[PDB]
Structure to design on (87 residues):
């Protein structure tokens, strides 16, 4: 009932449309680490 | 239909081409049918767009 969802799911989809969802995952969580494997 | 108890119909886009986003910032196809709202849904293969 809160008319907010398409406003926000816009920003949900767009971050991976940009791939900046991946950028922000890699920010505080790089996949490399001290153990590469 | 079977899990809810409600009705449906089966129609068609004359393009069948996911629509085409225009430089009119508009559409034919499955999207232009709902710009005009001649339809209600489109249940098939789907491409995802913001």
């Amino acid at each position: 009932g809160s008319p907010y969802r398409d406003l926000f799911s816009q920003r949900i989809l767009e971050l991976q449309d940009t791939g900046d969802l991946d950028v922000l995952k890699q920010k505080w969580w790089p996949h490399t680490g001290r153990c590469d494997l | 239909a079977k899990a809810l108890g409600f009705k449906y119909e089966i129609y068609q886009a004359p393009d069948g081409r996911y629509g085409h986003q225009l430089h009119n910032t508009s559409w034919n196809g499955m999207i232009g049918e709902l710009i005009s709202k001649r339809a209600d849904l489109a249940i098939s293969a789907i491409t995802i767009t913001p």
